[PDB]
Motif scaffolding. Structure first.
Motif, PDB file in Angstrom:
ATOM      1  N   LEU A 291      44.681  29.634  33.033  1.00  0.00           N
ATOM      2  CA  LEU A 291      46.025  30.028  33.783  1.00  0.00           C
ATOM      3  C   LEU A 291      46.246  31.098  34.213  1.00  0.00           C
ATOM      4  O   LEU A 291      46.470  31.184  35.450  1.00  0.00           O
ATOM      5  CB  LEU A 291      47.094  29.448  32.468  1.00  0.00           C
ATOM      6  CG  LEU A 291      48.677  29.688  32.808  1.00  0.00           C
ATOM      7  CD1 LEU A 291      48.799  28.841  33.871  1.00  0.00           C
ATOM      8  CD2 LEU A 291      49.448  29.461  31.398  1.00  0.00           C
ATOM      9  N   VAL A 292      46.145  32.173  33.394  1.00  0.00           N
ATOM     10  CA  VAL A 292      46.251  33.447  34.013  1.00  0.00           C
ATOM     11  C   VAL A 292      45.193  33.799  35.270  1.00  0.00           C
ATOM     12  O   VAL A 292      45.789  34.268  36.042  1.00  0.00           O
ATOM     13  CB  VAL A 292      46.049  34.577  32.892  1.00  0.00           C
ATOM     14  CG1 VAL A 292      44.540  34.574  32.254  1.00  0.00           C
ATOM     15  CG2 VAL A 292      46.134  35.894  33.478  1.00  0.00           C
ATOM     16  N   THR A 293      43.999  33.196  35.298  1.00  0.00           N
ATOM     17  CA  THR A 293      42.968  33.415  36.056  1.00  0.00           C
ATOM     18  C   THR A 293      43.561  32.524  37.527  1.00  0.00           C
ATOM     19  O   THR A 293      43.503  33.391  38.552  1.00  0.00           O
ATOM     20  CB  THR A 293      41.811  32.879  35.712  1.00  0.00           C
ATOM     21  OG1 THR A 293      41.481  33.504  34.376  1.00  0.00           O
ATOM     22  CG2 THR A 293      40.818  33.331  36.869  1.00  0.00           C
TER      23      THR A 293
ATOM     24  N   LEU B 246      46.597  31.833  38.202  1.00  0.00           N
ATOM     25  CA  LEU B 246      47.831  32.425  38.918  1.00  0.00           C
ATOM     26  C   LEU B 246      47.547  33.630  39.413  1.00  0.00           C
ATOM     27  O   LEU B 246      48.355  34.047  40.414  1.00  0.00           O
ATOM     28  CB  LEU B 246      48.837  32.433  37.666  1.00  0.00           C
ATOM     29  CG  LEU B 246      49.567  31.097  37.453  1.00  0.00           C
ATOM     30  CD1 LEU B 246      50.672  31.281  36.321  1.00  0.00           C
ATOM     31  CD2 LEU B 246      50.306  30.745  38.601  1.00  0.00           C
ATOM     32  N   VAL B 247      46.992  34.740  38.984  1.00  0.00           N
ATOM     33  CA  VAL B 247      46.741  35.979  39.403  1.00  0.00           C
ATOM     34  C   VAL B 247      45.603  36.060  40.547  1.00  0.00           C
ATOM     35  O   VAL B 247      45.772  36.637  41.643  1.00  0.00           O
ATOM     36  CB  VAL B 247      46.679  37.168  38.394  1.00  0.00           C
ATOM     37  CG1 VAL B 247      45.375  36.903  37.680  1.00  0.00           C
ATOM     38  CG2 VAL B 247      46.750  38.499  39.092  1.00  0.00           C
ATOM     39  N   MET B 248      44.331  35.519  40.181  1.00  0.00           N
ATOM     40  CA  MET B 248      43.191  35.565  40.717  1.00  0.00           C
ATOM     41  C   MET B 248      43.091  34.818  42.141  1.00  0.00           C
ATOM     42  O   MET B 248      43.227  34.851  43.081  1.00  0.00           O
ATOM     43  CB  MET B 248      42.072  35.290  40.295  1.00  0.00           C
ATOM     44  CG  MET B 248      41.883  36.375  39.038  1.00  0.00           C
ATOM     45  SD  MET B 248      41.302  38.076  39.091  1.00  0.00           S
ATOM     46  CE  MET B 248      39.720  37.301  39.998  1.00  0.00           C
TER      47      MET B 248
END
Lengths: 39, 39
Positions: free
Chosen positions: B7-9, B11-13
């Motif tokens: 999820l974080v990957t 969304l930011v990456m």
């Protein structure tokens, strides 16, 4: 330093961000000394 | 699903990998039924 969250991304994908840990925590719930100078 | 590490990957990456949980946990230490057919 890049470690423990940026490590896995910098290896398996190839990019990293600085505040990745704070991003994660927010996204998913969970000295001084004196010196001579002139002012 | 993508969740809690992809999820974080994603969304930011901008990228996301399938078995992210396993590779992450690795780098740092951390019923059927019957039907008829012609065999």
């Amino acid at each position: 330093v890049i470690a423990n969250t940026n490590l896995v991304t910098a290896l398996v994908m190839g990019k990293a961000v600085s505040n990745m840990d704070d991003v994660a925590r927010y996204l998913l719930g969970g000295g001084s000394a004196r010196v001579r100078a002139d002012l």
